[PDB]
Amino acid sequence: AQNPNCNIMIFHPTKEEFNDFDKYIAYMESQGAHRAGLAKIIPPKEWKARETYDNISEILIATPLQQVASGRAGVFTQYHKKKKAMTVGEYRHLANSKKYQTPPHQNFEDLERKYWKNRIYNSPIYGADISGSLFDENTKQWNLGHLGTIQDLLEKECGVVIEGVNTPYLYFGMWKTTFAWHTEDMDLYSINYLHLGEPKTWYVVPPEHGQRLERLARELFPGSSRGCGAFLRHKVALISPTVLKENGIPFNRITQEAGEFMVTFPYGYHAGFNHGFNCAEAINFATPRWIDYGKMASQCSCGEARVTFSMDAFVRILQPERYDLWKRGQD
Numbered sequence: 563a564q565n566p567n568c569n570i571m572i573f574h575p576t577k578e579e580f581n582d583f584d585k586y587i588a589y590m591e592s593q594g595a596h597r598a599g600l601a602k603i604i605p606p607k608e609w610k611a612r613e614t615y616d617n618i619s620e621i622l623i624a625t626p627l628q629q630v631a632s633g634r635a636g637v638f639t640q641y642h643k644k645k646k647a648m649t650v651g652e653y654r655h656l657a658n659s660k661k662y663q664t665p666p667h668q669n670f671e672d673l674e675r676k677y678w679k680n681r682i683y684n685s686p687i688y689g690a691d692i693s694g695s696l697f698d699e700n701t702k703q704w705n706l707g708h709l710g711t712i713q714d715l716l717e718k719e720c721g722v723v724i725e726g727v728n729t730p731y732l733y734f735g736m737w738k739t740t741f742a743w744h745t746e747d748m749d750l751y752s753i754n755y756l757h758l759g760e761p762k763t764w765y766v767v768p769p770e771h772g773q774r775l776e777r778l779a780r781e782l783f784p785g786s787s788r789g790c791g792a793f794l795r796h797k798v799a800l801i802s803p804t805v806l807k808e809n810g811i812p813f814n815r816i817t818q819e820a821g822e823f824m825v826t827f828p829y830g831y832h833a834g835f836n837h838g839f840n841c842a843e844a845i846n847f848a849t850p851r852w853i854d855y856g857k858m859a860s861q862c863s864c865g866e867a868r869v870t871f872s873m874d875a876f877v878r879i880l881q882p883e884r885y886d887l888w889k890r891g892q893d
């Protein structure tokens with residue numbers, strides 16, 4: 563068995579290997595990358611996403627989200643308070659202000675210490691989930707707006723034609739902006755490209771151990787767990803590495819820098835934080851190996867998780883027994 567300790571693997575494809583996206587994902591899995599739940603892909607030196615980032619300031623962040631924490635430093639939830647619209651230029655200035663800017667630090671480990679010590683005492687503002695792309699249309703390799711769609715994959719594997727679309731999302735971050743512990747919708751893959759700015763630190767639980775994380779989360783968030791049998795689908799709970807280690811939960815960590823891709827694999831729980839002002843692009847995708855995970859994915863039916871239009875078909879076709887209850891949660 564390749565990668566039996568479930569370590570995060572880092573790949574350096576050549577320009578030739580960067581042509582065929584599906585083939586390279588399958589290659590990474592042949593080497594055991596998926597066992598970690600997360601892999602890093604460093605693009606060949608010849609590649610670029612676009613020519614420059616000098617002209618992005620006029621993008622609008624219609625609904626910036628202030629991430630307000632509750633709990634203790636290592637075990638907390640966050641809720642998202644909606645703020646007034648602002649441009650990317652306005653948000654960048656905000657991120658760099660004395661109130662929000664990255665503190666002085668020695669290295670990524672010092673910054674990580676500071677994040678876990680102090681996160682709850684601040685409420686950073688995240689420009690998340692903005693439909694759009696920063697890839698140049700002429701970038702032909704690993705262009706996250708030109709991937710094969712999940713609807714087409716389902717149709718290729720299973721023969722059923724379904725409605726729905728699959729487009730990327732932009733994320734503008736600042737120091738302490740946080741992504742809560744989650745797997746993707748329908749336990750899909752994700753791919754995330756850090757276009758510019760400061761790093762993103764990731765934490766990940768191997769897919770084979772995801773239920774250990776779920777059991778800890780039910781212990782640590784007992785009211786949330788009584789409310790919903792899949793409350794991590796709400797994407798609000800944080801647990802620190804120290805708490806994970808104290809509870810014996812297998813996990814790994816890695817820092818993504820600008821110009822690097824990360825892939826999350828089906829049922830790979832992940833969480834993390836941004837180091838300072840940055841911009842990432844991410845999208846979900848599928849492969850043949852996903853189908854079995856999609857069929858088994860948990861679902862939130864309590865009403866909290868509320869998701870895209872395109873998840874309807876995935877539930878309807880892969881999980882017809884669950885469909886009626888899940889759709890009630892949608893309405």
Ligand SMILES: O=C(O)CNC(=O)C(=O)O
Pocket residue numbers: 733740741752753754762826832842844845
């Ligand atoms: O970058 C973020 O805030 C969150 N991203 C992801 O969870 C991802 O790409 O799957």
Ligand SMILES: [Mg+2]
Pocket residue numbers: 617618619620621
């Ligand atoms: Mg612009």
Ligand code: NI
Pocket residue numbers: 744745746752826832
């Ligand atoms: Ni994710």
Ligand SMILES: [Zn+2]
Pocket residue numbers: 789790791792793795796862863864865866867
């Ligand atoms: Zn729920």
